[PDB]
Amino acid sequence: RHVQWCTISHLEQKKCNDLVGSCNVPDITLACVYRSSTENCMAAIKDGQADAMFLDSGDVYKASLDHYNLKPIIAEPYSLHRELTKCLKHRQESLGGDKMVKGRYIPQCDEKGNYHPVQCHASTGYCWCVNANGEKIEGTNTTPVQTPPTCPSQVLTKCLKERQEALGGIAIGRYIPQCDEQGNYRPMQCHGSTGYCWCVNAIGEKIEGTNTPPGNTQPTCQSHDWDTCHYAVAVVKNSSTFQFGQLKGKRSCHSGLSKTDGWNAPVNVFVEKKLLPWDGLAKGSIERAVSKFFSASCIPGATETNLCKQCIGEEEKKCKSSHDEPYYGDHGAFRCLQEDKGDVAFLKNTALPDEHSGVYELLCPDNTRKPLNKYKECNLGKVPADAVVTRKAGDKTKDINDFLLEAQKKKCKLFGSPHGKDLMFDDSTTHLAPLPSEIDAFFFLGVKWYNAMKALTEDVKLPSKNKVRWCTINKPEMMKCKDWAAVSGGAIACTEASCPEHCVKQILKGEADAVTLDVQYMYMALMCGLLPAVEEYPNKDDFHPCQIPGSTIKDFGTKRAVALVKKSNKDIKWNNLKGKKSCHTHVGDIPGWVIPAGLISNQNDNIDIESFFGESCAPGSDTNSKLCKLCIGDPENPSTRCSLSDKEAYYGNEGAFRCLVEKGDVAFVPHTVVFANTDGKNPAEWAKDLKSEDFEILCLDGSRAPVTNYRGCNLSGLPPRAIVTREESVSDVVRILINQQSLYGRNGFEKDMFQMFSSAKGQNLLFNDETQCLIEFDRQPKDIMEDYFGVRYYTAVYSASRSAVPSELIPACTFKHCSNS
Numbered sequence: 001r002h003v004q005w006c007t008i009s010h011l012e013q014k015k016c017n018d019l020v021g022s023c024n025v026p027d028i029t030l031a032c033v034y035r036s037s038t039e040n041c042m043a044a045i046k047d048g049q050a051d052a053m054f055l056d057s058g059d060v061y062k063a064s065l066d067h068y069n070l071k072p073i074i075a076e077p078y079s080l081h082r083e084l085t086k087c088l089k090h091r092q093e094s095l096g097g098d099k100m101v102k103g104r105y106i107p108q109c110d111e112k113g114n115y116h117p118v119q120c121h122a123s124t125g126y127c128w129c130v131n132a133n134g135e136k137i138e139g140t141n142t143t144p145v146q147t148p149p150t151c152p153s154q155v156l157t158k159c160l161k162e163r164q165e166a167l168g169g170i171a172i173g174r175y176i177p178q179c180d181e182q183g184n185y186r187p188m189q190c191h192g193s194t195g196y197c198w199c200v201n202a203i204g205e206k207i208e209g210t211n212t213p214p215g216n217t218q219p220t221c222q223s224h225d226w227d228t229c230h231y232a233v234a235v236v237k238n239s240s241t242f243q244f245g246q247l248k249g250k251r252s253c254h255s256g257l258s259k260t261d262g263w264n265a266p267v268n269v270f271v272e273k274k275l276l277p278w279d280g281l282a283k284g285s286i287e288r289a290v291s292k293f294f295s296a297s298c299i300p301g302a303t304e305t306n307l308c309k310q311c312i313g314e315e316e317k318k319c320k321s322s323h324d325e326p327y328y329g330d331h332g333a334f335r336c337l338q339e340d341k342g343d344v345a346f347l348k349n350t351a352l353p354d355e356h357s358g359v360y361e362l363l364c365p366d367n368t369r370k371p372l373n374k375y376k377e378c379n380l381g382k383v384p385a386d387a388v389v390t391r392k393a394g395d396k397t398k399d400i401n402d403f404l405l406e407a408q409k410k411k412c413k414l415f416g417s418p419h420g421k422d423l424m425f426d427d428s429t430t431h432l433a434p435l436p437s438e439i440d441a442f443f444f445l446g447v448k449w450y451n452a453m454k455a456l457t458e459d460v461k462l463p464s465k466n467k468v469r470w471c472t473i474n475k476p477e478m479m480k481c482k483d484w485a486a487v488s489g490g491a492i493a494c495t496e497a498s499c500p501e502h503c504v505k506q507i508l509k510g511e512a513d514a515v516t517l518d519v520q521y522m523y524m525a526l527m528c529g530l531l532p533a534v535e536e537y538p539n540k541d542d543f544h545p546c547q548i549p550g551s552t553i554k555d556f557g558t559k560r561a562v563a564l565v566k567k568s569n570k571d572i573k574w575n576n577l578k579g580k581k582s583c584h585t586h587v588g589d590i591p592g593w594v595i596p597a598g599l600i601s602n603q604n605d606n607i608d609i610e611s612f613f614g615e616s617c618a619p620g621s622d623t624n625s626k627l628c629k630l631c632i633g634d635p636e637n638p639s640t641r642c643s644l645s646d647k648e649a650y651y652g653n654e655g656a657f658r659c660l661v662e663k664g665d666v667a668f669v670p671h672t673v674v675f676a677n678t679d680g681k682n683p684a685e686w687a688k689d690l691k692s693e694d695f696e697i698l699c700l701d702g703s704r705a706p707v708t709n710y711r712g713c714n715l716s717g718l719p720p721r722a723i724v725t726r727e728e729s730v731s732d733v734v735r736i737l738i739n740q741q742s743l744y745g746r747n748g749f750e751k752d753m754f755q756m757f758s759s760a761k762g763q764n765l766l767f768n769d770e771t772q773c774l775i776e777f778d779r780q781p782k783d784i785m786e787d788y789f790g791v792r793y794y795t796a797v798y799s800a801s802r803s804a805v806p807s808e809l810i811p812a813c814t815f816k817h818c819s820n821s
């Protein structure tokens with residue numbers, strides 16, 4: 001196994017070559033491939049000449065476009081503010097679940113708010129070991145008949161870990177970090193031998209401008225600093241006296257044309273302050289307008305002559321996006337100011353001097369100047385993290401992650417070098433961790449910074465707030481949507497994707513505006529930040545909420561999952577279904593499987609619904625399991641048993657009701673199946689005048705109820721299907737869809753020209769054909785999960801937690817960003 005690292009300079013290739021010698025990662029060999037600039041390396045990676053490089057967030061965006069097709073895979077974790085610990089968050093969630101779902105696991109936290117390494121489930125007496133995230137170490141479960149397991153201690157905090165490491169087995173003459181009672185870093189740190197002191201934030205990163213030799217006054221250190229985003233700054237010497245608003249005509253040093261801190265951040269502010277006569281691409285290129293602003297500059301990678309005049313690279317190296325240009329990058333631009341080739345340098349806080357005292361200070365955009373350690377209040381914006389990138393195909397992602405994880409374990413010299421600063425990686429880097437597997441540049445940079453860097457390259461025509469771009473998941477849907485657009489007078493347009501999750505992505509990225517989602521995609525949509533705009537109202541018995549919008553809705557008409565038993569079976573209650581014989585409509589059904597499997601899992605320590613029951617029928621399971629024993633294949637015997645077809649006599653709503661009456665004690669079905677198959681409503685012989693007053697439903701409190709009281713004695717009601725959009729577009733989509741409904745709904749004034757809720761092109765296109773109308777979602781002041789799902793369903797299926805991961809998109813779309821206001 002090989003990893004080929006692309007380097008951009010002779011200096012960086014030197015450091016990479018040293019790593020090949022010094023860093024011994026078994027199973028994976030590093031090699032180094034030289035190219036002359038950042039862009040030549042991007043192309044080398046695209047072409048397979050190399051596998052990975054580290055990119056500034058501005059280059060991350062550039063590499064993500066079709067020219068190069070690279071994606072970020074590894075970056076340093078950062079933090080925006082202090083958060084609740086995980087254990088305390090989990091406690092709060094589960095205590096907010098549905099109290100009628102009895103016997104749920106409530107985590108046990110310790111005096112620092114972490115998980116006790118032994119976790120227990122009160123109602124079952126089972127204990128197990130957990131990791132720091134509170135996730136069960138599988139195979140450590142012990143039963144109440146046994147003593148609690150012996151679980152290893154939790155991993156130490158960063159500060160306590162690095163303290164114990166530094167001590168080895170007192171470490172004389174070396175820094176030993178000082179930790180607070182919570183095990184985080186004390187704000188002030190001192191070197192126990194040199195006498196120097198400085199400030200750190202809560203995770204131990206140094207605050208620049210605070211390093212203090214002994215005998216001097218130290219700057220005040222802020223406590224509880226969890227904002228570890230990097231900030232773009234403008235740095236100047238204290239011997240000059242201009243302010244930010246007087247930058248016109250000065251000499252400037254920039255980290256580089258493609259860097260977010262050297263280009264995007266300052267240009268963004270130059271434009272917001274109208275220091276720059278530029279606003280759109282009709283006014284020329286931004287680089288040209290900047291060329292008219294400064295007199296001479298060093299901006300590596302530029303083409304305008306004055307914007308390279310101040311660089312000092314020899315011959316073809318001059319003004320190259322490469323360390324062979326001595327003024328390239330953050331520490332290059334600072335050097336350019338130091339040697340007085342510029343009056344101001346544009347870089348980021350992590351490249352500022354460590355020492356408090358000296359000739360440098362910060363130029364604030366509000367036309368004041370402030371000390372180096374005040375960058376959080378004197379900056380040109382937070383900027384995104386930087387990242388290691390590879391091909392979008394990801395053929396080398398695992399080898400790159402393995403190598404860097406193991407090199408970091410062995411403490412290889414990744415993050416400094418005698419040959420120079422910021423070679424291969426930023427010298428300020430401390431750890432590189434893998435990014436979510438579905439991350440791309442949009443989700444890594446965040447919509448705000450992504451749009452901001454797009455905005456400097458093209459005129460981004462924002463689509464109209466009076467048009468809803470509907471996202472379709474198959475060709476018949478697209479055709480029905482084009483017919484809607486033709487009568488809509490421009491209010492409706494169409495986009496095409498392959499599945500609902502890709503529609504969610506398009507809505508997030510501003511390529512579409514709305515889509516109808518089945519219940520099973522809503523957790524993912526709500527977790528990514530979309531909101532229900534309107535919902536499908538399916539109650540055929542009441543059209544009043546559809547006639548007069550805004551009206552009160554007595555019953556929304558959604559199905560309610562119930563547990564169905566015969567009145568003859570007086571001994572069975574909810575609390576004793578273990579080992580009984582159960583009938584499921586099929587594996588994957590929500591009212592007959594997901595809702596029951598969720599409740600069994602929450603009350604029995606995730607013990608399989610397979611093992612929970614005795615002999616059952618659940619079409620879709622493997623034919624050899626105890627979930628197919630009750631399954632009667634086909635009356636016309638063929639290889640049709642436990643099958644996902646009407647071949648299986650026990651498949652579906654009515655089929656599970658068969659399995660109950662024939663050979664079973666309980667069936668999980670919607671509340672409608674019994675009424676559709678009793679009172680002689682089904683002609684078949686087995687339901688021969690079978691009486692609705694011959695069955696009951698099981699309540700979760702151990703009681704029972706006649707099947708007519710499904711409203712207050714159900715496993716869980718389902719939520720309606722929902723039309724979701726971005727938070728800011730809810731009001732638009734509601735207004736447009738309600739107007740369309742008055743024209744083309746079931747009582748539409750123009751229903752002869754188009755019908756929203758049916759079609760000849762197929763079934764349930766865009767909306768479900770049984771929809772009565774779309775009802776605006778009345779947002780309540782509670783968690784959106786509880787608001788949309790209802791507490792019962794949220795608890796039953798997701799444990800009332802925001803931490804389930806039904807889709808691998810969720811970790812990408814919830815990734816946190818470094819954006820401004």
Ligand SMILES: NC1=N[C@H]2[C@H](COC(=O)NS(=O)(=O)O)N=C(N)N3C[C@@H](OS(=O)(=O)O)C(O)(O)[C@]23N1
Pocket residue numbers: 535553554555556557717719720777778779780787788789790791792
């Ligand atoms: N904000 C809000 N509006 C409701 C409508 C449906 O309204 C009924 O279901 N009507 S009703 O007559 O049957 O109550 N949409 C939802 N997805 N919800 C979930 C339900 O959760 S519930 O609280 O478990 O019903 C709800 O809260 O109603 C509701 N939450």
